[PDB]
C-alpha cells in the first residue's frame, strides 16, 4: 500500500504533486486484475492540471509514501521489483506505447529486493530523462509486491501479484532527440497469467531465480537508481 507524493528534478523537490501533476488514485490499494483498464495508470486516469518541466539528461526522482510523507513508505512484507515506463501523453496510455526505462528486481550482490532498498531510500528512485522528442509524456512508475503472488489473481482474487502504479505528467523541453521513442507495450495486456515474474512464490522459490516481467529495458534508456536524492525533512 503505497502512493507517489511527488517528484524531484536534479535533486530539487517539485512539491506535493498529488492530483496536481500525479494522476493520483483515491487510495493506496493495489491493482491486481491484469486485464483491467486500471493497469494503465491506476483507477483514476485523467489529465491533471500540471506537467513537471524537465530536460533530457535530468535526474527525475519519484518519491513514494504509505500514509504520510517520508513514513515507512511501504510495508516491508511487500518484497518485489520496481519498473518505470514512458509513453507520449497524447496516447493517454492507450495502445502499444509503454517503453521500459528502468527495472530493478532482486540484487544478488546485496541480497535485497528493489522494494527493500526503496524503503531505505525514503521512497526515492530515479531515472535519467531520455533523449526523446520534446513534448508531454506520462512516466508510469510501478512497484509489484509479490508477498501473495504464488497464486494468480485470476484463480484466487484474494491473492495475486499487487501493482502499485503511478503516472506522472512530465514535459520534456530540451532534447536532442538522439533516441526517438519507439512503439512499446500495452497496459493492460503486456502482463498475463503466463508472463515470467507475475506468479512467483517468494517463500519457496529463490529470489536469485526471479525474472521480472518483460518487456526488457529499452536500448535508449540512460539508467537510474534507488537512492535518496533529497531530505524531505529539511522542509
Ligand X SMILES: OC[C@H]1O[C@@H](O[C@H]2[C@H](O)[C@@H](O)[C@H](O[C@H]3[C@H](O)[C@@H](O)[C@H](O[C@H]4[C@H](O)[C@@H](O)[C@H](O)O[C@@H]4CO)O[C@@H]3CO)O[C@@H]2CO)[C@H](O)[C@@H](O)[C@@H]1O
Measure CA of the first residue to CA of the last residue in the chain; give whole Å: 25
Picked from ligand X, Cl ion, Cu ion, none, the partner binding residue 66 (CB below 5 to 8 A depending on kind) is ligand X
217 φ/ψ angles, rounded to the nearest 5 degrees: -60, 130
Q: Among 1, 66, 69, 117, which residue interacts with Cu ion (rule: CB under 5 A)? A: 1
What does the alpha-carbon distance between residue 219 and residue 186 come to, in Å, rounded to a whole number?
18
Q: Among 20, 75, 89, 128, which residue interacts with Cl ion (rule: CB under 5 A)? A: 75
Residue window 2-41: x/- pattern of binding to Cl ion, with contact defined by CB under 5 A: --------x------------------x------------
Compute how many residues bind ligand X; rule: CB under 6 A: 7
Q: Which three cell numbers stand for residue 12?
A: 530539487
Give the footprint of ligand X on residues 133-172 (CB under 6 A): 147
Give the footprint of ligand X on residues 79-108 (CB under 6 A): none
Helix or strand or coil: residue 120?
helix
Taking Cα atoms as reference points, which of 187, 92, 82, 188 lies closest to residue 138? 92
Q: Which three cell numbers stand for residue 37?
A: 483498464
8 Å CB contact between 215 and 190: yes
8 Å CB contact between 196 and 211: yes
The answer to whether residue 117 forms part of the interface with Cu ion (CB under 5 A) is: no
Taking Cα atoms as reference points, which of 96, 130, 89 lies closest to residue 223? 130
Residues that bind Cl ion (CB under 5 A): 10, 29, 43, 75-76, 96, 103, 111, 121, 132-134, 151-152, 155, 177, 179-183, 196, 211, 216-220, 227-228, 231
Residues that bind Cu ion (CB under 5 A): 1
Residues belonging to the binding site for O2 are 147, 162
Contacting positions for ligand X (CB under 6 A): 1, 28, 66-67, 75, 77, 147
Amino acid at each position: 500500500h503505497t502512493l507517489v507524493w511527488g517528484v524531484w528534478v536534479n535533486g530539487v523537490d517539485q512539491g506535493d504533486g498529488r492530483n496536481i501533476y500525479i494522476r493520483s488514485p483515491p487510495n493506496n490499494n493495489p491493482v491486481k486484475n491484469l486485464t483491467s483498464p486500471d493497469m494503465t495508470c491506476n483507477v483514476d486516469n485523467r489529465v491533471v492540471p500540471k506537467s513537471v518541466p524537465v530536460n533530457a539528461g535530468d535526474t527525475l526522482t519519484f518519491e513514494w509514501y504509505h500514509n504520510t510523507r517520508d513514513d515507512d513508505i511501504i510495508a516491508s512484507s511487500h518484497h518485489g521489483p520496481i519498473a518505470v515506463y514512458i509513453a507520449p501523453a497524447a496516447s493517454n496510455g492507450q495502445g502499444n506505447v509503454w517503453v521500459k526505462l528502468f527495472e530493478d528486481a532482486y540484487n544478488v550482490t546485496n541480497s535485497t529486493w528493489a522494494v527493500d532498498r526503496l524503503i531505505t531510500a525514503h521512497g526515492q528512485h530515479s531515472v535519467v530523462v531520455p533523449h526523446v522528442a520534446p513534448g508531454d509524456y506520462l512516466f508510469r512508475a510501478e512497484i509489484i509486491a509479490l508477498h501473495e503472488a504464488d497464486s494468480l489473481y485470476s484463480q484466487n482474487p484474494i491473492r495475486g501479484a499487487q501493482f502499485y502504479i503511478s503516472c506522472a505528467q512530465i514535459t520534456i523541453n530540451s532534447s536532442d532527440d538522439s533516441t526517438p521513442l519507439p512503439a512499446g507495450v500495452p497496459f493492460p495486456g503486456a502482463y498475463t497469467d503466463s508472463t515470467p515474474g507475475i506468479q512467483f512464490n517468494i517463500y519457496t522459490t529463490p529470489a536469485t531465480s526471479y525474472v521480472a516481467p518483460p518487456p526488457s529495458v529499452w536500448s535508449g534508456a540512460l539508467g537510474g537508481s534507488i537512492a535518496q536524492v533529497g531530505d524531505a525533512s529539511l522542509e
